[PDB]
Design a protein around this ligand. Structure first.
Ligand code: NAD
Ligand code: NAD
Ligand code: FE2
Ligand code: FE2
Lengths: 382, 382
């Protein structure tokens, strides 16, 4: 239906895929890698691990661990500098979403024009970014496989969006071994983010038969494995399932886009720098009820995929039960009860709702609302 | 077991996807294209169509329409000659699986030099093929998105399989506008080929959560639209659904690989010069029954995705009902009833089985047999 499916040419997954991925670099002609990650990744030795595997392949590396949650333009320039001083010939992002976005920005500018803003928009760059490999460590973002790059400009205090086929990593890596170390909180929040991606992509007005297939399979796997990974981060089968699941969710949202959960969430965790993952998790149930008036039938499909015994229910009751199941799941893994517990203030709703309707994710939401409707939706999230 | 998921980074689909894909070449830098197609595509004017759209973007093009079913080394060589004399900077395949494979080979050799036979096997090429855009016109092969390139050596009558991430097209195009012209025979054939891909991918020992989801969705869409597309090729929705379906089947088989149906069918064609699509179509049900002893349960899963009322049946029964549904679907769209009609001769069975066991697709079949069993499988299809 006049659509486009974006995704990396190569996506390595499963236990041991990291070594496989690095091993595949031998003979590639790369000599100097730029490892873009965060403080924690470098501290716990994950960076070292990569650097050594790389050395065993005759490839040296330089490290930039100055990435903070919700990347910034200063982080990028910071990486470009380190990149230049080491004359890096390729980039490797390591960690959760933040490192990938920063890395995508580094690699794009590395081979293209100047500042980041010059690429704020859709397919702005004319040249492919420097080869980029993204190694994911959380089970919920999928930023390692998206063509999205959101860099925050602390000047104008506005977050720029770079939707470009050129920021799609050349190779994505989802090795569950690097995920076993996720504490319960990050596991629950990123997993609920993955679930949100499935729900919003499946509900999107830009949905295709492909995104639908991936979205439902993702919700199914998350429904059968998120609780386990939260109650036992060492359960390798559950970790591998979530890695696959979060990728499937990405296959879906990277191409069908999202909705009001994210449009609204980006405002709480944007102006109030809250952890992306949880904001979506708490908002999800409430947005589903709102959208249920238009896509009750499809919310039921998701509930059915989730293993719920509702196939015989009408779409209305099926959607409610699915909405209830999401609430029960969130509660079972420690997700906050409402925005009140997130530190949000009801007096900020009018501002949040206005900026929410402005978010690019709001465009594909199945139900379109006005200022009043988004404000009341917010207030109900408290 | 860890896995890898291969796919072009950009995949354009739906009505109008052709115009979008060509428009996106603007500012790409490509000024001279080698269009690889066949006699039909050229005479019917599809080649001119594409050539003209390229012109509107200031891109010249040279055509090679010598491709025939089961692309050969000779065809590859001729195409490289035209490429050379025109110094084409990128390749565009146009048509079904034959042009895509021929184009992948031409593109791979253009940058890697040597001969086609040198790349037979896994990831043998050292450099990425010349940029390649694949425009698919049949609804069943998906070769516009795979990392497989099958070329036939006419001199010694030998099919060579090139399994290399470097042959993955840069951009795939699936515009149902180019599939509307498929005659009922080709619609039925390629449609059954896509269904075979789904079955074999779902039955494969290299299946993953991702290939499973894609395979099942492909089977569900085919069971719902193939018959409609055959009865009336002017039905755009049907054509578009078949296009997404065949792509989804490719998402599955390019990654989990195939099985005995293709292992055997590749021989019938590479010997009696029979159409790829029809060979698998007639063999499918006989191989499914053969494999039913090991994967009856998964075979039942496909049946359910196909909408069969077998959810409440046991695996053996569910599987048998699935296989019968396949036989009935094939009959309903005019697939020849057996290998005798195709012109296959029992006297050649011993050699067909021998080579079938040596086919790369055979390694993933869920049930491994021997010379005698494969010969008997063949004869059972006469
Ligand atoms: N394109 C979009 O619209 C979109 C969608 C979803 C998320 N995002 C972006 O993605 C980012 C969210 O990334 P995220 O939640 O994966 O994490 P971050 O938010 O990437 O990292 C969070 C923290 O978890 C740590 N961590 C990562 N893996 C770990 C492990 N295995 N064990 C222990 N600690 C680990 C990090 O070191 C860090 O301290 C945000 O910047 C968000 O805005 C963008
Ligand atoms: N992943 C892979 O690499 C892969 C998978 C399966 C099959 N294959 C290969 O692909 C080939 C099979 O290709 P196929 O069945 O698509 O067909 P071809 O075999 O591409 O073409 C068959 C005939 O159909 C015609 N045709 C194609 N599109 C048409 C249209 N829109 N309208 C009217 N006629 C049209 C052709 O001009 C030709 O006469 C085999 O050679 C096989 O080995 C490759
Ligand atoms: Fe998200
Ligand atoms: Fe096939």
């Amino acid at each position: 239906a006049s659509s486009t499916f974006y995704i990396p040419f190569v996506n390595e997954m499963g236990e041991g895929s990291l070594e496989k991925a690095i091993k595949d670099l031998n003979g590639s002609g790369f000599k100097n890698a730029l490892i873009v990650s965060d403080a924690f990744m470098n501290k716990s030795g994950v960076v070292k691990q990569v650097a050594d595997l790389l050395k065993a392949q005759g490839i040296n590396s330089a490290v930039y661990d100055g990435v903070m949650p919700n990347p910034t333009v200063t982080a990028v320039l910071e990486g470009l500098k380190i990149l230049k001083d080491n004359n890096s010939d390729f980039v490797i992002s390591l960690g959760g979403g933040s490192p990938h976005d920063c890395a995508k920005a580094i690699a794009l500018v590395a081979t293209n024009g100047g500042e980041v803003k010059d690429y704020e928009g859709i397919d702005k760059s004319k040249k492919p970014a420097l080869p980029l490999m993204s190694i994911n460590t959380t089970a919920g973002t999928a930023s390692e496989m998206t063509r999205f790059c959101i860099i925050t400009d602390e000047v104008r205090h506005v977050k720029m969006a770079i939707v470009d086929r050129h920021v799609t990593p050349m190779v994505s890596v989802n090795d569950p071994l690097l995920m076993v170390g996720m504490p319960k909180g990050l596991t629950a929040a990123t997993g609920m983010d993955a679930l949100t991606h499935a729900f919003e992509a499946y509900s999107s007005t830009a949905a295709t038969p492909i995104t639908d297939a991936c979205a439902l399979k993702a919700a199914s796997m998350i429904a059968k494995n998120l609780k386990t990974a939260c109650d036992n981060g060492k359960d390798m089968p559950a970790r591998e399932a979530m890695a696959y699941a979060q990728f499937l969710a990405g296959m879906a949202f990277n191409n069908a886009s999202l909705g009001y959960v994210h449009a609204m969430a980006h405002q709480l965790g944007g102006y109030y720098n809250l952890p992306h993952g949880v904001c979506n998790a708490v908002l999800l149930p409430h947005v589903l009820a709102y959208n249920a008036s238009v896509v009750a039938g499809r919310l039921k499909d998701v509930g059915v995929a989730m293993g719920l015994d509702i196939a015989n229910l009408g779409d209305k009751e099926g959607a409610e039960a699915t909405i209830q199941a999401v609430r029960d799941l969130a509660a079972s893994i420690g997700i906050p009860a409402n925005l009140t517990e997130l530190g949000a203030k009801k007096e900020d709703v009018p501002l949040l709702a206005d900026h929410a309707l402005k978010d690019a994710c709001a465009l594909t939401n199945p139900r379109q609302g006005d200022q009043k409707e988004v404000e009341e939706l917010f207030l109900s999230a408290f």
